[PDB]
Structure formats: structure tokens, C-alpha cells
């Protein structure tokens, strides 16, 4: 990330069929597969490197990234169930308690005697 | 500075005295005007105007020509006024680009009126020569706090809705006609048909691809 | 050389004198003009049965000249001529109770007496100057300082001669003169006495051994001059630092450490500094060794001058290089605080030389940092200590200076310095990183007729006037609310015992929410002074002297010039609190969730803030319902999902943006009726006449602008670049430049600046002082806020050669010092936007450097672009620096130069801060002083208050301020002939009520003269001929009078 959090992202999607589809199956060419793979990975790399940690979480909440990938891959093939499967923290940068207190949202005592 | 009546390039100096400001212990605001020579039909009977004051609008142009006509017993009716971009927000026409500075143009109703007010300007230059107190005063439309807060005011939602609706209407109609004439199976006079791709919408855009 | 040869002839001419009693000696130096510089305490004739004797010494040399590594010192240097004593005049019972010291004193007195007699013989006295002084500020060891004035006139050489008096080799036992041993008998050890007498016995062996190492190596003299110039530009010296001075390490100690490192140095005593090195190699090896190896606390080094150097894991609680061949602790003249600050200087220099991308030769070796105390250290405080007299110590000092106290610190100077340092470090603890004192008023020079340096100023009888304390503060731990103490048990611990004995009435017993029990002490934060200031005041008023005076009115006035918002307990809120920022961000999350749950036929992609308060750099922290702030409406950029059916015309596209914002407005007026909304026709980008910012008012008292971005906007802007005409190019390039400046790199800028500001918390308040002072100098109408942000973060991200700023005044003088020393016409400017240890690569650095070369080839003076400000987010460096003219550039640079000259000559005081913060109001063609009829300070919310939004958004616009629109429209009209400047933040810059502005306008010197009357000349002129025209100044004057007719109060011309 721009927050220097090393991350590994697993995302998945399915080859749906058309409304006009007379075929039982919905299978596409490996050319389409690799092209769409490259398109997806570009989208992920761009969005994450543009994002920070809390920004990535806020992006992650309302599933908007997979919709973006859907509208990108709208011309190649009709797809479905496009979903980021999994997130893997791999490295975390140095400690910042002030940043953690900021992203979460000082204290006196009670005079014991 | 008293006998400077005109310029040798045809331009005629036009003074305008100023009142006494409280923060300044009277100059003569100098303008210039010339007849316009242009092949445009709507740019006929017009005065090239130079060094206009702040907010030189149609009402103050009419006041100036009315003072001139009342002084010189003449008749000269202002029709319209053109090219008054004093702050310069229309130096680029980006709309048709992607689809005259500090001067203006003053249109009159006929050649009789423009020659008449031109003789009025000639006698005003002679006024600058001989009698500098007979020169006219330009009282600006002094922009106030009310005008600045009209600049600062929000827009009217009904106005927005109307302009948006009509703009989408005209843009949709012109884009529909563009899609039709682009993908309407064009053939040339000699037997020759062009090639046109799918979802392509503008012949100008085809020529820009060739560019 | 010939001078020292003649003085050798003089000294061998000098006769001798025998064993003599104190009565004979005092009669001698009583009927002679020379007075014996007796070290304290003076010999008293009852406790002495020994006598004195001067015979011929043995003569030698030492210093950079004897090591043959001298430079041409501009201020002046010295060469040491040593005289070493006769051991036949010495006895074994001379190194206890100052006996050898008094022998030395009378030795030196007779020496300077008969040298004066031979000077009155040879008649060089008309241009020589003769005086007493101390060997590296050692009052227990006086010396001779021979200086000159304007055929032995060596005054043009800038050299002086220091006569040192030393004992022969192995006269007194070094194991008896170990620092753990006692030789002053009244039991505590005498460390300075042991070290000084042992060094006086063992000076010359170090010369021999160091000359041997210089002979064995090849670049020893060059590494010596490197160490010398580095220590000089850092502000170091070989002087005894125990007396309120910075020293203990200079050329001699540096060279001795080079010899020890060539002899070994490792824990395994292996060779880590090798003889085949070059000069850079030797310097790098010693600086790594000093950076990574502690000599003080947890380890120390040992070596033998006659055998390898081995590092052992016991630090003697002092910087410890133990010469076992002479049993000498080399670095005894150094304090622990001086040691740790030179260790951190070795560390910062190590990181500097490890910087492979950039060059660091200039900042390492060509910057003297000891010019300004406020620039070198973070915090500073003056403490007047009028102690009085020797007998009035006991009634002025809270402590006691007794016999063992005199044994430990023979000098009351070292005693008081040690006392105040330990009480300060104990009372401060984790809140500060490093602490230094300067006993202001200290001297080392005094004439021959005096026994010592006598002082009578500052309410004392000692060589000082007061004490200035300076601190390198911990930035994260300064603003802690409680000073933490040890825990509590039934049986009381020694640690909490000395804690309560130290803190007294501040000591208490406190419990917390986790259920922890400990002793603490209570403090109350202020917006005018730090808790650090309150606790240093309390500590030095309790445990040192009740008559002391501790202050810093400088940082008082800086904290006052920090703007004060109309907030409850804002007089108690200190500088580090970001609570209003957290409040605006929480309200922003409320709007975030409601607009994210709102529906529109196309999906909302991303809503992002680029507010200046969001990135924590608004001029004020915002107040609810204080909508008259210029930074009230924070910019919020919108992006929706990618549609393949966008209108591919620009006006239809921006009008579709208008329609989508209308849909947001109708649905929010439907389902979120507690919020107010309107549309504001934004036009801030030229030639786009359709922008609409959806302005939202929120009953948390806040307001925002909402504006749509699209890939379709970028693709049509690039289409405009493609189809614009060749001469219409650069104007449209400036338009797209401002577009991407306010849209595209703005989000990445705010993001990384929030991140790096949370790393450097103290950048957010120092930027608030910068644009406030810049507003008082009125250049805000031309400089961009994000560029100002980069200027303010530059000394934080590039602290070299100083430290990070941990305080407001330190950061402000650092940004002023950088802009004062900067030359934008030749020097480029690159930031590495990273946390403390995504750094910039050398290839990228060469790319942006070649970009700067291309820009400076196409524009070598800066008539198109003055400042080159680049980063990772800015590979161009033209993004936030475009649109500023060369007169404004020269004005701000001359402002920085006159600022550094003010602080140089007039020094630091409240009047210098006032002269900094007042405008100059000079070099202006016309000056219009205007007053808004209503003051806006209370409505803006700066503490000298609004409680709601009024019913009419037109009334909101009434309470907005129109002088900014005034000046910017005057600038759109007169970009051709004038340059104008104004005050943007009236609520902080409108006098007392917040209703005053000054408008400064400068003529273009081209339109100052006469020109040919052109159709595109575009200026109000008055023709001087029928062909040539001169500008119509009075027409301009009445025209601006009429444009601001209602607000114009007075007008002045040049």
C-alpha cells in the first residue's frame, strides 16, 4: 500500500451465461481468461497503491471495487460472482500509536488515599 | 496634453473627467473609437472602442450617446454592443473547440446614426483641444456590497432544472442525428463506400482519427 | 618557527631559583607586578611545610602544528609549547592535596615574570600581548597565552602560543591517579584532579605515539583535519564541558581515538580501522565506530599507547577510553549529555553519508550549526541565578556545598552545573531527549595581575551571569499530561521514596481505569506555555534556589501568536490537540455513510476529502457554525462508476454533473432534512463556465463543497490539448495544470501529508504559524496553500544538518532559515516523502534533476517559473509553483533575508517577533486601506460566537467577506498592467474587530514607461504624443476607488 502494508489479494469470478444463451455451459477462451486476469490485477494494483490502509477498508466495505472490475470487463465477457476472496497481510510497517488513536477516534486518575 | 486631439493611426482620443474622491486630492479618462470595416452582416455599422471604463454596459453607452446627441443636436441610436469581455472568461471557446482584448464593438441602427455620432466624437476631440471643461463625465455603475453578494449568492434550483433539461434535450437530439448520419450507410458519388466501426458516432471524430 | 626558536633562546637564557618558603614567595610576587595565579583553594601557610623550586624544564611542542595537520584558521589558532618539570624538584609526596598544583602555579608565575623581564630586554613588547588563560577552560590548570598585535610580528599568521606546564613521565603513579582513587584527603575520589595531574605527567607520550601512528598511516593528517572541521562546524572543542559549556572532545581526542582505532577497537580487539584506508575510509570508520559503540553507559574502550585496543562491555558511567599504558581515562573532560549529543551527531552524519542518492558534503562539512541556539536546540529557557557570595550559598542554594562536595567538584561551577543537570533530567525524564546548559557569562581569559577570573555581575562572584538551558525535546512525549512515577506497595520502595522526596507537594497516590496503583503528579496544560515550562519552573524553583528566575517569553509570545479558536477550555487546550479535526472527521464519516447508503442509477465509486483542515493545515482549527472562515467549506471530490454512455461534450458533461448533483440535492432534501444544501457556481478553473459545487451545511456546524470528477473530464481535457491551436497551447496548458493541481495530485498530496504529519505531529502547528505570518505579509493571494505546505514540511523531512523540529519556534526559524539560504534560480528542491527510519530512487532522482535542468535551460532566470518543488507525487515540480511572479518571489526572498538579518543583529526578543509579524508596506505603487463595515472575528470564531445557521442562504452570503472576490477580479482585469495583494483571513488580520484590509498594488515597470499605441495594448493610458502613450494612473486610482467604493476608506500612492 501507500501505507507500506505488504498485502496479498485473492479475488474470484465466474463465467455466467447470456440471456440469449442456448448453450448449456458458459466457457470462454484462455485468451479471454488471461486478458481478464491482467485487467483485474491492474485494477487491484492501481487501486491499492493509490489507497492507504483505512482507505482500503472503506473501499472494501461497499463492494465497489468488484463493480469497477465488472464495468471494466463488461466488454470482454459476461461474468458473475466477481468477488475479492481473501486478504493477506504480509508485512506491517513501524509502530504509530498516534496514528492508531487517530484512526480509532488523555486520562487522569481518581485520587486514591 | 491639451492639443492632443487624435492619433495619426485614425484613432480619436476621448476624455472623461473624474469627480473628487475623498482619498485623492481631476484627470481625463481617455477612450478611443474608430469605424469598423468587416464583412460580417451583424458586424455592420459598428464602432471599434478602446480603453472603455469599468462596466461599460449598454445603459451607460446609451447615456454617453444621449449626452453627445443632446449636446450636438444630433440623432444617433445605439442598436447593440459586442465583445465586452473585460475580465476575460471567454478567451477560449472550449465547447466548439472539443466538439479583441480590452476592446469592444458598438453597433448602431444605421450608417446615418454611426456617421452622426462619429461627427459627435470629432467635435468632442475638438472639445479636448479647446475647452477641456466641456468634456463629459463618466460616472461608473459603482459595484457595491449588494453586487458582490449577488456574486456570492446561490443559484435558483428551478433555473438549474430548466437549463439542464433543455441542454440534455438538444444534446440528445444532435447526438442522435450524429449517430444516424454516421452509421446511415454512406456511399459516395462514384461507387465508393467508406468503412465505419461499431459504436462510432462522429464524422468529425473519424477525421480526427485520420489526423 | 623562527619566533619559537628565539623564545627557546629566551627560555634557555632564563635563570633559575631555589626552594623557598611562602613568605619569600609572597614577598617576591608582591614586590613584583606579577601575581601568582593560585588555583582554588589557595595554599594557606599553616598546612604547608614543603617549599618551591624552579629549574630548567624540558621543552617540546604539541597541537595540530606538531602533528603537521594545520589549516589556515580565519579566527585564529595556537601552537602548544610544553615545559616539563624536573623530577629532582619533584617528590613522591607532591600529588596529594594540591602540592604539585601550587608548585606549578609559582613555577608559572616566575616563568611569566622573567619572560616579561626578557621581553623588556628584547623590546618586542610594543606589538606583543601577554595574558593568562586556562588549558581548554581548565581553572585548575592555568597556562600562558602569547598573542600579537599589528621583526617578529607574527600577527598576520593568526597564531598564538600556548605555554603548557606538565610533569615528566611516570613521576606520580598512574594507578594512584586512576579516576577511582582519592588524593585530596579531608572517602570520595577526585576524578578531575586525577585526570588532570595524570595528563600533565603524560602529555608527551601521546605526542610520540600519535606521531608514530601518523608515520604508519598515509592519510592521518587529512582525517585529522576532517575531524577538526566537522567538530568545528558542529560546535565542539576539547574544552572541559562540566562547567556549562559544550566540549570534552576536539582535535586531540579525535586524533587519539583514530590511533586507538588503528590499534584495534573491536570487542575481539581485531583491526577494524585499517592502515590501507583513504581519508573518506578513515572518517567513515571512526564515525561508524562512534555511532555504534558506547563509551559511557554499557561499554567502554581500552588501549595501550605502547597492546591492541579492546572494547569491554562495562561503561564507567562516563565516556571511557582507558589507556592502560598510562592508566588515563581520555574523555574525562566530557559530560554524559555532551557525549550523547555527539553520539547522535555521529549517527546523523552516518545516515547523511549513507545517503547514496543525494550529496551530503555541503551539509556535513560546510554548515556551522552553532550560530543560533533556537536553531540548534528545540526548547530554550533563561534562568537568572543571583547566588551571591561564598557564605551566602548556604542561604541561597537549597543544597549544600561541603568538603566532599568540593572534593567531587573542586569548582563550584562544575558543582552547580552537575546539580542543575541531574535535577533537570530527573524532573523531566522521558519528555525530553537531550539537555544542555550554558552558564552565560563564563570566561577563560584574565590578565597577569589577577589570581583568577573575578566576576561581580549577575548577583554572583563566579564566572557567569545566568544559565540558559536548552533542550532537544521528545516530540511524542512532551505533551503527556502526567509525569509518571514508581508504583506503591505497603513497604515503601526507595525509588518511589526519592520520587516523593523530590516532588514533595506534587507527590500523591493515584489509581487508573485499568486498576493500576502508582505515584503521579498533576499538571494543567495551557495554550500559552507548555507543561515542560511549568515543570522546569517548578523543579528549578524547588530544589536549586528559591531566588532563581526561569522563563521563556519568546515561546510565550509564539504560543500567543498561535491563533486561539472560540472553544470551551481552549485556553487550556495545548498545541498537540487535534480534537476539532477529529470532530470534523467524525461528521465527515456521518455524511460519508449517509451518501454511501443513498442510491443513484449509477454507482458511487469514491468520495474523498481534500480539505486543508482534513490534512490538518487550516489556518484555524474550525468552529461549529463559524461559516465566515475562508476554510469553512472543505473541498470533497466525487467519483462515480465508469459508464460507457457519458456525454462526450464538455458543457453537456458538466451539465450532467449538475444534474447528478441535483439528484443528490433532491434526495438529501427528501431523506436527510436535518441538513441544509445549496448550489454554488464554481468557476475557479478558467474557460469552464459551468462548475457547480453542492454546498452542504450540517447541524454539527460544518460545511462542505461537493464536486464531480470523471475519467471523461480528463479525456476531454486531453482532447482539448490535442485540438488547441499552437499559440493557444500554453494558456490551456496552464488551465489543465491548475485543473490537475486542484483535482488529481491533490488527493495523493492530502493522503501522504496526513500520513507523514501523523509521523511528524509537530509539522501541523508550525505550518499554521507560517501562513499566518505570510498573511501578515499579504502574499497569500499568489502563493498556493499546498506549496506552502511543502515549504513548511521541508525542514522536517530534511532535518540535515540539524535535528527534527520538536518545537514551534524551532520549526519556524528552520523554515525561515531554509528559505533565507535558498536560491531557487539555481537550486532545485526535492522531498523524500517518507516516515522516519517508499524512498525516492536514484534513477528517478536523475530524471527529476534532468527535468530541472531542462526547465532551467528553457527559463534560466525564472520568468515563467521561479520555484522548483518536487516529490514522488510531483515528478514535474511545476504543479503548485506556477502562477507566481518574479516580483513576489524577490519580495518573499528579501523578506526572509531581512528576517535572518533581524535575528542575527538584534538577536532574539519579543520586539523582533513583533517586527517579524508586522507588514513592511513598502515598495508599493498604491496602497488602499479598506474596512468592512462589519467585523468578522466573533463570527469566524477566533478568541478575542455564532450558534446556528440563519434561515436565508442569501444571509449566509451576506456574512461572507467580499474583499477576496474584489481583489481577485481586480487581478483578472489588471493581469496585463498590475500585480495586487490583499489580506485573505480578515478574522485574524483585521485589527481588533477583524474588519480591516490593506490592498497593495505594484505597477509593471514595462507599462510604467511609454509604448506605441496598440490595438492589443490593453491598459488605461493617457497619450503623451499622437503615437506614444503613457499609463493613466489617476484613471486606475479612481477606477479602483469606484470598484471598492463602499469599502474604500483611504488610498495612498507612492
Curated annotation (Swiss-Prot), chain A:
The modification Phosphothreonine is found at residue 113. Signal peptide: none annotated. It comes from the Eukaryota. N-terminally acetylated by acetyltransferase NatA. It is found in: Cytoplasm. Belongs to the eukaryotic ribosomal protein eS1 family. Component of the small ribosomal subunit (SSU). Mature yeast ribosomes consist of a small (40S) and a large (60S) subunit. The 40S small subunit contains 1 molecule of ribosomal RNA (18S rRNA) and 33 different proteins (encoded by 57 genes). The large 60S subunit contains 3 rRNA molecules (25S, 5.8S and 5S rRNA) and 46 different proteins (encoded by 81 genes). eS1 interacts directly with uS11 and eS26, which form part of the mRNA exit tunnel. Component of the ribosome, a large ribonucleoprotein complex responsible for the synthesis of proteins in the cell. The small ribosomal subunit (SSU) binds messenger RNAs (mRNAs) and translates the encoded message by selecting cognate aminoacyl-transfer RNA (tRNA) molecules. The large subunit (LSU) contains the ribosomal catalytic site termed the peptidyl transferase center (PTC), which catalyzes the formation of peptide bonds, thereby polymerizing the amino acids delivered by tRNAs into a polypeptide chain. Present with 92400 molecules/cell in log phase SD medium. There are 2 genes for eS1 in yeast. This is Small ribosomal subunit protein eS1A. The lineage of its organism: Eukaryota, Fungi, Dikarya, Ascomycota, Saccharomycotina.
Swiss-Prot record, chain B:
Keywords: Nucleus, Ribosome biogenesis, rRNA processing. One of its GO terms (molecular function) is rRNA binding. It is found in: Nucleus, Nucleolus. One of its GO terms (cellular component) is nucleolus. GO terms for biological process: maturation of SSU-rRNA; nucleolar large rRNA transcription by RNA polymerase I; regulation of ribosomal protein gene transcription by RNA polymerase II; ribosomal small subunit assembly; rRNA processing. Signal peptide: none annotated. Coiled coil: none annotated. Present with 2610 molecules/cell in log phase SD medium. Plays an important role in the synthesis of 18S rRNA but is not required for the 5.8S and 25S pathway. Is necessary for the cleavage at site A2. Is required for efficient association of RPS27 with the pre-ribosomal particle. Component of the 90S pre-ribosomal particle. Belongs to the RRP7 family. This is Ribosomal RNA-processing protein 7. It comes from Saccharomyces cerevisiae (strain ATCC 204508 / S288c) (Baker's yeast). The chain holds residues 3 to 231 of 297 of the full protein.
Swiss-Prot record, chain C:
GO terms for molecular function: RNA binding. The keyword Phosphoprotein applies. It is found in: Nucleus, Nucleolus. GO terms for cellular component: 90S preribosome; CURI complex; nucleolus; nucleoplasm; nucleus; small-subunit processome; UTP-C complex. Keywords: Nucleus, Phosphoprotein, Ribonucleoprotein, Ribosome biogenesis, RNA-binding, rRNA processing. Pfam families: Nrap (PF03813), Nrap_D2 (PF17403), Nrap_D3 (PF17404), Nrap_D4 (PF17405), Nrap_D5 (PF17406), Nrap_D6 (PF17407). Its main location: nucleus. Involved in nucleolar processing of pre-18S ribosomal RNA and ribosome assembly. Present with 3260 molecules/cell in log phase SD medium. This is U3 small nucleolar RNA-associated protein 22. The lineage of its organism: Eukaryota, Fungi, Dikarya, Ascomycota, Saccharomycotina. The gene is UTP22.
